[PDB]
């Protein structure tokens, strides 16, 4: 039985990371520092999950301007920009996502996000893509600093499962990245992977299904096999 479906957010519900990159760059520009993350560098920086963590890693190694503000302050400013960007643009859910979530709801299946993205990021996506606050879409929101150890650690998925009160055998995860797959699998979850722009280069050995589009599931039916 599928009692619950768990979703990563960025790269799974919607293709958002390019917008995140824009928000980072426009933030650095706004602060007047010489930092710029191009697509190539951002692809590498995405192996560090967590916004603050990604900023920290970069600032530990980069040779340009020193940080003018602490990590958290930079991330807050970037978050405000991302939230604004989500509100104005026309971000679409990835193919198949809307239909799967509607099917699940009709079927009395609970939905959760398990993500390294922050809560304001989740809210922004839900408002823009679903037209409703996150709590109206997802029964359980496990996000950001709610756990100490980020993906590939399974901790965020363990938290999500604990809050859902659903054991892994009655749940399934949808992911877009290797770190995500590893985190789901470490929590004992079957995991459906469909990569996005920034993770198409990765390898997903051990994914229960690997798809070009979540639409290939044909909804709930594709989760059983």
DSSP string, 105-118: HHTT-EEEEE-SS-
Q: How far apart are CA 78 and CA 25, in angstroms?
A: 9
- As a whole number of angstroms, the distance between CA 127 and CA 131 comes to 5
C-alpha separations of 129 from 18, 24, 76, 116, 134 in Å: 16, 21, 22, 19, 10
* Helix, strand, coil percentages, rounded to 5, for the chain: 50, 10, 40
Annotation says 212 is catalytic = no
Angle at 215 between CA 212 and CA 221, to 5 degrees: 120
- Cβ neighbours, 10 Å, residue 142: 23
CA atoms of 177 and 203, how far apart (whole Å): 9
Which of 3.40.710.10, 3.30.200.20, 3.30.360.10, 3.40.50.1000 would CATH assign to domain 1-14+92-225?
Answer: 3.40.50.1000
Outline which parts of the chain fall under CATH 3.40.50.1000: 1-14+92-225
Residues of the chain with CATH 1.10.150.240: 15-91
Binding residues: 8, 10, 17, 50-54, 75-78, 115-121, 176
* Domain at 15-91: CATH architecture: Orthogonal Bundle (1.10)
Question: Where do the DSSP E strands lie in the chain?
Answer: 4-7, 110-114, 140-142, 171-175, 190-193, 209-210
Residue 6 CA to its chain's centroid (Å): 11
Q: For 45, which DSSP code?
A: H
* Integer Cα distance of 182 and 160 in angstroms: 15
Q: Is 65 a catalytic residue?
A: no
Resolution, expressed in angstroms to one decimal: 1.9
Which residue ranges are tagged as binding site for substrate?
Answer: 8, 17, 50-54, 75-78, 115-121
Q: Which helix (H) or strand (E) holds 156?
A: helix 155-164
Q: At what angle do helices 71-88 and 51-61 cross, to 10 degrees?
A: 130
Distance CA 157, CA 187 (A): 6
């Amino acid at each position: 039985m599928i009692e619950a479906i768990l979703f990563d957010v960025d790269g799974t519900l919607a293709e958002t990371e390019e917008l995140h990159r824009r928000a980072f760059n426009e933030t650095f520009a706004a602060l007047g520092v010489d930092w710029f993350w191009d697509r190539e560098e951002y692809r590498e920086l995405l192996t560090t999950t967590g916004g603050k963590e990604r900023i920290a890693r970069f600032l530990r190694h980069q040779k340009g301007d020193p940080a003018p503000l602490p990590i958290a302050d930079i991330h807050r400013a970037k978050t405000e920009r991302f939230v604004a960007l989500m509100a104005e643009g026309e971000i679409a859910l990835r193919p198949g996502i809307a239909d799967l979530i509607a099917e699940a709801k009709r079927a009395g299946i609970r939905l959760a996000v398990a993500t390294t993205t922050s809560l304001p990021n989740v809210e922004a996506l839900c408002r823009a893509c679903f037209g409703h606050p996150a709590r109206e879409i997802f029964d359980v929101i496990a996000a950001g600093d709610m756990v100490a150890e980020k993906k590939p650690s399974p901790d965020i998925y363990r938290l999500a499962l604990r809050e859902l009160d659903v054991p892994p055998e009655r749940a399934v995860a949808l992911e877009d990245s290797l770190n995500g797959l590893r985190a789901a699998k470490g929590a004992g979850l079957r995991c459906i992977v469909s990569p996005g722009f920034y993770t198409r280069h990765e390898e997903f050995a051990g994914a229960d299904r690997l798809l070009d589009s979540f639409a290939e599931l044909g909804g709930l039916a594709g989760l059983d096999l």
